[PDB]
Design an enzyme around this catalytic site. Structure first.
Site, PDB file in Angstrom:
ATOM      1  N   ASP A  48      10.878  14.913  -1.018  1.00 22.74           N
ATOM      2  CA  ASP A  48       9.793  15.476  -1.805  1.00 22.74           C
ATOM      3  C   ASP A  48       9.976  16.977  -1.912  1.00 22.74           C
ATOM      4  OD1 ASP A  48       8.712  13.115  -0.062  1.00 22.74           O
ATOM      5  OD2 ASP A  48       7.224  13.171  -1.678  1.00 22.74           O
ATOM      6  N   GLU A  71       2.450  19.236  -5.999  1.00 20.86           N
ATOM      7  CA  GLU A  71       1.796  18.534  -4.907  1.00 20.86           C
ATOM      8  C   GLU A  71       1.998  19.187  -3.543  1.00 20.86           C
ATOM      9  OE1 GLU A  71       2.909  14.409  -4.289  1.00 20.86           O
ATOM     10  OE2 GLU A  71       1.652  14.276  -2.503  1.00 20.86           O
ATOM     11  N   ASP A 141       4.685  16.349  -9.615  1.00 20.54           N
ATOM     12  CA  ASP A 141       4.735  15.456  -8.431  1.00 20.54           C
ATOM     13  C   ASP A 141       6.213  15.239  -8.181  1.00 20.54           C
ATOM     14  OD1 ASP A 141       4.493  13.603  -6.500  1.00 20.54           O
ATOM     15  OD2 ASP A 141       2.914  12.411  -7.481  1.00 20.54           O
ATOM     16  N   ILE A 143       8.071  13.783  -5.743  1.00 20.13           N
ATOM     17  CA  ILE A 143       8.214  12.328  -5.613  1.00 20.13           C
ATOM     18  C   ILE A 143       6.832  11.719  -5.670  1.00 20.13           C
ATOM     19  CG2 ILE A 143       8.933  10.397  -4.242  1.00 20.13           C
ATOM     20  CD1 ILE A 143      11.103  12.110  -3.024  1.00 20.13           C
ATOM     21  N   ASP A 144       6.585  11.002  -6.738  1.00 20.86           N
ATOM     22  CA  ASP A 144       5.379  10.188  -6.862  1.00 20.86           C
ATOM     23  C   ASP A 144       5.713   8.790  -6.306  1.00 20.86           C
ATOM     24  OD1 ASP A 144       2.778   9.496  -7.572  1.00 20.86           O
ATOM     25  OD2 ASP A 144       3.493   8.477  -9.356  1.00 20.86           O
ATOM     26  N   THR A 146       5.779   8.220  -2.751  1.00 25.45           N
ATOM     27  CA  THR A 146       6.524   8.482  -1.518  1.00 25.45           C
ATOM     28  C   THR A 146       6.567   7.253  -0.597  1.00 25.45           C
ATOM     29  OG1 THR A 146       6.011  10.856  -1.608  1.00 25.45           O
ATOM     30  CG2 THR A 146       6.702   9.993   0.462  1.00 25.45           C
ATOM     31  N   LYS A 266       5.260   2.935 -13.537  1.00 23.70           N
ATOM     32  CA  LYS A 266       4.399   1.996 -14.208  1.00 23.70           C
ATOM     33  C   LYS A 266       4.076   2.388 -15.634  1.00 23.70           C
ATOM     34  CE  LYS A 266       1.255   1.880 -10.825  1.00 23.70           C
ATOM     35  NZ  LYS A 266       2.137   2.437  -9.730  1.00 23.70           N
ATOM     36  N   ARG A 280      -5.882   0.790 -12.409  1.00 28.03           N
ATOM     37  CA  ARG A 280      -6.101   1.570 -11.180  1.00 28.03           C
ATOM     38  C   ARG A 280      -7.570   1.863 -10.927  1.00 28.03           C
ATOM     39  NH1 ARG A 280      -2.082   5.118  -8.813  1.00 28.03           N
ATOM     40  NH2 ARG A 280      -2.953   6.546  -7.258  1.00 28.03           N
ATOM     41  N   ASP A 293      -0.507  12.987 -10.609  1.00 28.55           N
ATOM     42  CA  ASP A 293      -0.295  11.564 -10.565  1.00 28.55           C
ATOM     43  C   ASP A 293      -0.389  10.909 -11.927  1.00 28.55           C
ATOM     44  OD1 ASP A 293       0.352  11.310  -7.868  1.00 28.55           O
ATOM     45  OD2 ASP A 293      -1.668  11.109  -7.184  1.00 28.55           O
TER      46      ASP A 293
HETATM   47  N1  LIG Z   1      -7.269   6.528  -1.933  1.00 26.26           N
HETATM   48  C1  LIG Z   1      -6.532   6.669  -3.031  1.00 26.26           C
HETATM   49  N2  LIG Z   1      -6.970   6.234  -4.268  1.00 26.26           N
HETATM   50  C2  LIG Z   1      -6.179   6.399  -5.399  1.00 26.26           C
HETATM   51  N3  LIG Z   1      -4.932   6.982  -5.298  1.00 26.26           N
HETATM   52  C3  LIG Z   1      -4.525   7.417  -4.067  1.00 26.26           C
HETATM   53  C4  LIG Z   1      -5.291   7.259  -2.925  1.00 26.26           C
HETATM   54  N4  LIG Z   1      -4.617   7.763  -1.859  1.00 26.26           N
HETATM   55  C5  LIG Z   1      -3.430   8.243  -2.301  1.00 26.26           C
HETATM   56  N5  LIG Z   1      -3.384   8.031  -3.660  1.00 26.26           N
HETATM   57  C6  LIG Z   1      -2.324   8.367  -4.603  1.00 26.26           C
HETATM   58  O1  LIG Z   1      -1.599   7.231  -4.970  1.00 26.26           O
HETATM   59  C7  LIG Z   1      -0.428   7.774  -5.550  1.00 26.26           C
HETATM   60  C8  LIG Z   1       0.663   6.753  -5.831  1.00 26.26           C
HETATM   61  O2  LIG Z   1       0.069   5.720  -6.573  1.00 26.26           O
HETATM   62  P1  LIG Z   1       0.804   4.315  -6.715  1.00 26.26           P
HETATM   63  O3  LIG Z   1       2.238   4.443  -6.361  1.00 26.26           O
HETATM   64  O4  LIG Z   1       0.566   3.856  -8.142  1.00 26.26           O
HETATM   65  O5  LIG Z   1       0.132   3.356  -5.735  1.00 26.26           O
HETATM   66  C9  LIG Z   1       0.004   8.821  -4.558  1.00 26.26           C
HETATM   67  O6  LIG Z   1       0.858   9.636  -5.284  1.00 26.26           O
HETATM   68  C10 LIG Z   1      -1.329   9.394  -4.068  1.00 26.26           C
HETATM   69  O7  LIG Z   1      -1.693  10.616  -4.657  1.00 26.26           O
HETATM   70 MG   LIG Z   2       4.256  12.988  -4.577  1.00 25.17          MG
HETATM   71 MG   LIG Z   3       1.781  10.973  -6.542  1.00 20.73          MG
HETATM   72 MG   LIG Z   4       2.005  12.504  -1.427  1.00 23.69          MG
END
Ligand SMILES: Nc1ncnc2c1ncn2[C@@H]1O[C@H](COP(=O)(O)O)[C@@H](O)[C@H]1O
Ligand SMILES: [Mg+2]
Ligand SMILES: [Mg+2]
Ligand SMILES: [Mg+2]
Length: 354
Positions: A48, A71, A141, A143-144, A146, A266, A280, A293
């Protein structure tokens, strides 16, 4: 007419996509020394930080006054951990420059030479802008996903440009994305470090194998007639979204097929036309989504012909509110409006039934 900006974004993301692809197993195997827990207990790794360093340094070498919302922060990192960041950047340089380097493009310069530990810290911390309603800033971001990265699965390197609170440019590198897994064809060269997706508002959405990134193929959402044939996109991590409420939406809409994967990859599948609805829903209503994000994805989906809103009110997302989105949850789809509205009103009704 963000021509220079698009090139910079693309090449920055491309370089960071290779590093992150290459490093993934070494990070996983050495979790003890590569991975840090932040104050919200979420992970952050050498990858990251390295990706954030490469990208901000590229933005700064080309646009020295530009502001960045990133981030991550360097605060508290040890020299030993920072030397590790530097080493991975230089290792990746030695592979990238042999094989992929693009003529007449600068990652570093006299002002931002990316040579020392203090350089790495300074660069990472240029990510400390708080955003807002007026003017231009980048949104990053590094790495989105992680947690996906660490599971050895999907992740994304995400960069956007916001101007006056609207996303004008987006670029998402999906270094592990293999289209044949989602029933579709892979393009020659995809195997080395995946694909890059990108868009500028009003000019369309495109993709390319990350190794290429010169020849660009236009993409667009598909338009199936019946929800019963549609495919959802959802995260893997149960703590990131409300899976049970999402299953209730699916069941109510007679959707029986979904794909789970981490990250803004996605959005890229949606923009490509390989699925129909990104769900989401928020677990806790107090959470505010981080703009990084969603920002890259917003413009890519829009240019591919889709629709992007929150998960309750059915309003467009507002990227001028600072670091976070004030609305609750996110839903995107291939459209049209009627399909989208059906999905978001279902989601609304589900949440109100709690
Ligand atoms: N409680 C949460 N509700 C929604 N998103 C979150 C939460 N905690 C962490 N994240 C985010 O979820 C992102 C990744 O989303 P995903 O890979 O689609 O599940 C991360 O980059 C975080 O910023
Ligand atoms: Mg990230
Ligand atoms: Mg992210
Ligand atoms: Mg993170």
């Amino acid at each position: 007419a963000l021509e220079r900006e698009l090139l910079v974004a693309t090449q920055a993301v491309r370089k960071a996509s290779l590093l992150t692809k290459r490093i993934q197993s070494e990070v996983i195997s050495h979790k003890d020394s590569t991975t840090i827990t932040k104050n919200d207990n979420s992970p952050v790794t050498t990858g990251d930080y390295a990706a954030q360093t490469i990208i901000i340094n590229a933005i700064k070498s080309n646009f020295p006054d530009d502001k960045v919302v990133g981030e991550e922060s360097s605060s508290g990192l040890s020299d030993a951990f920072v030397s590790g960041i530097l080493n991975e950047i230089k290792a990746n340089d030695e592979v990238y420059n042999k094989n992929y380097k693009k003529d007449d493009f600068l990652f570093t310069n006299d002002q931002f030479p990316l040579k020392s530990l203090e350089d790495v810290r300074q660069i990472i911390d240029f990510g400390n802008y708080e955003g807002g309603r007026k003017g231009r800033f980048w949104c990053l971001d590094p790495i989105d996903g992680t947690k996906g990265f660490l599971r050895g699965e999907q992740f994304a390197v995400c960069l956007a440009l916001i101007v006056d609170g609207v996303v004008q440019l987006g670029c998402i590198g999906c270094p592990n994305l293999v289209l044949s897994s989602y029933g579709a064809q892979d393009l020659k060269g995809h195997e080395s470090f995946g694909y890059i997706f990108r868009a500028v508002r009003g000019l369309g959405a495109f993709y390319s194998p990350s190794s290429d990134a010169e020849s660009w193929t236009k993409i667009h959402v598909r338009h199936l007639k019946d929800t019963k044939d549609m495919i959802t996109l959802e995260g893997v991590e149960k703590g990131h979204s409300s899976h049970d409420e999402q299953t209730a939406i699916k069941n109510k809409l007679n959707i029986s097929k979904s794909l789970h994967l981490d990250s803004q990859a996605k959005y890229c599948l949606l923009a490509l036309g390989l699925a129909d609805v990104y769900l989401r829903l928020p677990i806790k209503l107090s959470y505010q989504e981080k703009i990084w994000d969603h920002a890259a994805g917003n413009v890519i989906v829009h240019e591919a012909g889709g629709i992007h809103t929150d998960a309750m009110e059915d309003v467009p997302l507002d990227f001028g509110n600072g670091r976070t989105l004030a609305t609750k949850g996110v839903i995107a789809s291939s459209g049209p409006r009627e399909l989208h509205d059906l999905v978001v009103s279902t989601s609304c009704d589900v949440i109100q039934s709690r």
